[PDB]
Subunit: 291 residues, 4 copies
């Protein structure tokens, strides 16, 4: 086999546009794999949401790592985890990376936002971000700490999101890429791809770029290919679909006080057993238990 | 407020047929609460499945307890946990109960099956179950250990499921109820309610009875009321609905390499924020952080 | 009388109180059997027993888990050194809630910037967290308690960070006005001069806790003369434990025998007693069939 | 050279080897610095440090977590006393896989029935797990290893449970034939007679590990004369640690002073060294902006 880390690294450096799909628990990870996706996106929003908490580092980094451990155990394709800012400074970030590596996770995506939120000024001006040298050094520490040379570090640049412009975005991307980032994730808050286009034009293909088209989803996918984008992340759609189904199913049963109107609309219990790989255990039990 | 334990206890002892809905993580727990359900069923099948593992005590009891801790943190109504056989003998069972009690879980359902599976004989005869006195004593230990007198212990009788008959079922139910069980969960493998009917007729209302109509779902709910059943558990439908939605959404995006055909079929990102109660944090940040 | 209340009464008592450091369930039980009315959950001791550095390497939930076993093993209150709350006010209050749920009696929070952001070690005074920011964190923790008697101790780092009496006084009054149950005043000196200066200037506005590790030759009655409320014996059990383990391990390594250690260590029977093994033997006799 | 391989070479070496008990990250590091080539992850020591009984009260994942910190803190192999694998063959192999992933080098499994099912303490010999069942558990563990050199030690309880040499021999051969890397032969006697009898009858079919705690006055060369492969110093660090903590805590309790302990315990500087604090100081200088 090919290591999961190697699988992800090849995807980031390939000449084709690659896609990874959001999963938020072991069950969704297996479903994503069975569908044919070559990679999984461990969404920070999805993992926190399934736990019932906010996407503001309320769950501890070890609790996040445990969710991902079950996800990694349930899939053969690489998982790239959204690790926010690394849960602290360079030291907390490299400790996280080593634990992820040991659990089979393929890479981690770190962002250059200030953590945690210390002020509440809600004006209309740009938001200060982590110092560029500090973040670049954080990326360097993670790369230096890896025991698997193919584990990936993706740097998420928050320049556009925070209200700054192309110049700030480019400076940060170049700095992180020079520090060893395996890819740059360029995001924006616009409902169109303009920030992405401006960046790809100025970037001059200095390294793989990852994008998240959630808000500009009507953009033709071939346009990303034309721009030389390396990977697209479908960020949170399984979580969103799960919520719609659970809200709908729950209301139906609540209203009917019966299962008649949901039984034919959901997978069978046997399909759950199949997704749990119950057959493999049945066989193991017949081989390892006395008759 | 009324303690969650008290809420569940009242439901088991009420004169009305009550209903609790399956939830398997913090997010589904909140959705179940928002729908109006007075209680939640922490399904052993659902919790293990969402983790990607089998429903054979592969996840440790503390890992199960952590999932339920997030569930309890995300709901105001009681959660009754399917705790299999208590993860060991009376001592492991009472330790589990105390930890559940401390995390806010309202009750636990324990079953009289042998644990773990030591043999593999796959004939067509009835399956040996835990010794009746041993299980009754286990129930007693849990009751004796409670620090909250309203925490509930539901005893699941496996007599029918294992191939024995009404007589064995009644003997076990009476024994567990005499040991202090707050309710008896009577289950069967039939696709009709015959075992349930035979039991309710012979039971002579010696205590609350809980049933799981998953396989005999076309039975009119009023029939359960006519039999004096105390509670109905809708066992695994949110999990089953979630899987259908995730499989469907994933395939669609996989096939289209676009989000156009799923965006209008799933809840919005803002609905996820609402379910995470992001607004409460925004307000807290404005009150507790310097401007 | 809850553990929280016990600790609150100690902080507000008219006598000098004492709490002994412990770092695991075993040592917490030993501190209790010795007669100490409270336990200090040392940040240095907990991280050291785990084998990591005292710089938030272990996650807050891993720390809470260590403390859970400690609380389960003791009947007297434990005051946890919670660093800066592991984040901003929201992380701090989530921590306080989990500690409350586990039976921990109080948390000590310090006003240092978190985490380390630069490595400049010139001679200047080290900047601390903003006073208003920390005061609000204390308030958020107090406002969040489900148990009115849970204690929040505010550790002032002014003297340590190189600032003067004016800063320490200023900080302490703000944290006390925000609701802190006590102020922990520390120094880097091998004499009690900073403490003496603070107590004189404080004018008994609230209970003061101190750690005399470095100025240990100062007579304890001197602290009583200054009106100090509580003394923390911060890390001697950890230090005694290391001395013992190093000596014992070396003896066995050199002798390739147990002959020279067997008579210098507690018997295996004492370990069983500390584990309350007889209690389980008695429970097994009651809850397991006699045959 | 992986830790697993190191342990395997020790079990199969031509010299008598020694492993020292440790129960947390700190003590594992101390055992390593002393020069020991291996560590014994004592079940009694791990449960005792947590403050619970040695009867699977702590969950297997909580035990694995303690061992994770131990493995992170040491470069030599750790052999974990894994009781009976925490369930049947499936629980055992899942445990082995998680231990492998954490860097643990081997697991010692015992053939006792689990868990306790009756409280009859007459005079008869205690029944053990079925020989075929346990042999198959060993095989399932061996078949499941991702690392060929991970070690499975089979602890035979025949002598302890009151059976004779014939039973011990019979069990050992079966577990050895199933693939066990070594046999741990234990006795309840204060003399080495059961071991002598077993070694004579064994005919060197495989490496044998022993625990001389109870017959500690027997000269070590005698074990070398019998062809014993490894000796386990089972619990002296835990015992030394309790002696130290009890004495230190009492001294401080009685004196209300540190004066009589300060010179008998290691300095705070030694704790920092053991924590590798300087290593972090150096990393901060490299990865944090100089200003």
């Amino acid at each position: 086999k090919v290591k999961k880390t190697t699988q992800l690294k090849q995807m980031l450096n390939s000449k084709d546009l690659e896609f990874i799909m959001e999963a938020h628990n072991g069950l969704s990870a297996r479903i994503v794999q069975e569908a044919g996706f070559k990679g999984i996106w461990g969404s920070g929003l999805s993992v926190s949401a399934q736990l019932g908490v906010r996407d503001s580092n309320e769950a501890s980094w070890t609790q996040v790592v445990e969710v991902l451990e079950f996800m990694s155990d349930a899939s053969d394709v690489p998982i790239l985890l959204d690790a926010d800012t690394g849960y602290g400074n360079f030291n907390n970030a490299r400790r996280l990376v080593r634990k992820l590596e040991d659990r089979g996770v393929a890479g981690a995506c770190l962002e250059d936002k200030l953590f945690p939120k210390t002020n509440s000024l809600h004006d209309g001006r740009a938001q200060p971000l982590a110092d560029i040298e500090e973040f670049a050094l954080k990326i360097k520490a993670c790369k230096d700490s890896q025991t698997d040379p193919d584990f990936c570090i993706v740097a998420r640049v928050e320049a556009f999101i925070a209200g700054w412009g192309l110049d700030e975005a480019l400076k940060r991307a170049e700095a992180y890429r020079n520090a060893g980032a395996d890819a740059i994730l360029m995001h924006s808050k616009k409902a169109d791809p303009s920030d992405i286009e401006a960046f790809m034009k100025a970037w001059n293909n200095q390294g793989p770029v990852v994008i998240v088209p959630t808000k500009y989803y009507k953009t033709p996918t071939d346009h990303f290919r034309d721009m030389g984008v390396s990977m697209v992340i479908w960020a949170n759609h399984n979580l969103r679909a799960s919520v719609s189904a659970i809200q709908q199913t729950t209301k139906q049963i609540y209203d009917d006080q019966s299962l008649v109107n949901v039984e034919d609309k959901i997978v069978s219990v046997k399909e759950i057993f199949r997704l749990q790989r119950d057959d493999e255990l049945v066989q193991a039990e017949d081989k390892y238990l006395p008759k």
